[PDB]
Amino acid sequence: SGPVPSRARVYTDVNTHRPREYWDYESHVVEWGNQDDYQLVRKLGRGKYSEVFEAINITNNEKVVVKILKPVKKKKIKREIKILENLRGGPNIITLADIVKDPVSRTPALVFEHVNNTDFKQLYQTLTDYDIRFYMYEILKALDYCHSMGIMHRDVKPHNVMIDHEHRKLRLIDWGLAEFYHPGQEYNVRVASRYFKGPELLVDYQMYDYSLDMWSLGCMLASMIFRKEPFFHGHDNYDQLVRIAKVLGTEDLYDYIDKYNIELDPRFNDILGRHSRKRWERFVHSENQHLVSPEALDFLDKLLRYDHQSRLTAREAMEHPYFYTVVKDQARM
Ligand SMILES: Brc1cc(Br)c2[nH]nnc2c1
Ligand SMILES: [Cl-]
Ligand SMILES: [Cl-]
Ligand SMILES: [Cl-]
Ligand SMILES: [Cl-]
Ligand SMILES: [Cl-]
Ligand code: NA
Predict the structure, then answer these.
(1) Same domain, 150 and 13
(2) Could you tell me which of 174, 150, 193, 178 has the C-alpha nearest to residue 94?
(3) Domain span holding position 34
(4) Domain check: are 262 and 222 in the same one?
(5) How many angstroms does the Cα of residue 129 sit away from the middle of ligand 3?
(6) Could you identify the atom of ligand 1 that is nearest to the CA of residue 176?
(7) Is there a single domain that holds both residue 136 and residue 285?
(8) Is 49 marked as a binding-site residue?
(9) DSSP E strands: which ranges in the chain?
């Protein structure tokens, strides 16, 4: 018999209750602008699917970011555009400003409102306890918003969080792997960077949901409070699950595989072994102790579960005692 089906605990049917056109990105008609409205200033970064530049909008002299979409399925381009259009104006969501093609090369590019090219990975190993809580709360605002809008990011990692530390502002970027959540849909498991992949991806459980992003967020939190980059340091996708099993233990892993009737790749049969669930105290030392609290560990424990249904939702996470002082300072301001 096949895998047992799964549904999101929250925002399950939000796309069903929308007009078809909200989520039917294959049918979306893009009005392509002229990239000659912009002048590229300098190259900022190189990605698998994109080259990214600082640019000037000639018309108003406003600074922008241009992402030139490296050759890829047209379906994937419409998906990213539609998701960015749907999420435009959401809290801590990057703002799509324009969609253009190079008149010569015909290559499509996305134009975003300017953010500094200071990604979270550059800062997140140097934060105070309070700033970790503050910026985690800001990421959760973006995730609860996109989940509530029927979208899962599927590539949450430090390199996809842009931060202006001076102005205490954060944006979640690179929506190129994001998808619409539809109950009963089986998704591609070849998403996310190795160190942030949830167990559902690693065991090839395809009927996953928004909760994938909450695993990735837990991997970021563990890295930051323990000053361990990455927290789960696998050699490859098989060893990645071994790294997780040595921390979360094998008892809960095999119970998860039994619950969803998952057919575990034979490769796993000799490498997972038998491991106790480790107390988080084992990762605490003199250099990270100032970032670790009972509140931080209680919260982390409730993100890093094998069973995606067990993990906190983004809104449940925002309710956790770890954020009480952030929530109080926000109301004060
Ligand atoms: Br602004 C901005 C910056 C980068 Br780097 C992005 N990668 N994908 N979308 C982006 C938007
Ligand atoms: Cl601190
Ligand atoms: Cl990263
Ligand atoms: Cl998919
Ligand atoms: Cl590890
Ligand atoms: Cl222990
Ligand atoms: Na402590």
Answers:
(1) yes
(2) 174
(3) 24-114
(4) yes
(5) 20
(6) 8
(7) yes
(8) yes
(9) 33-34, 38-46, 50-57, 62-69, 96-101, 108-113, 151-152, 161-164, 169-172, 179-180
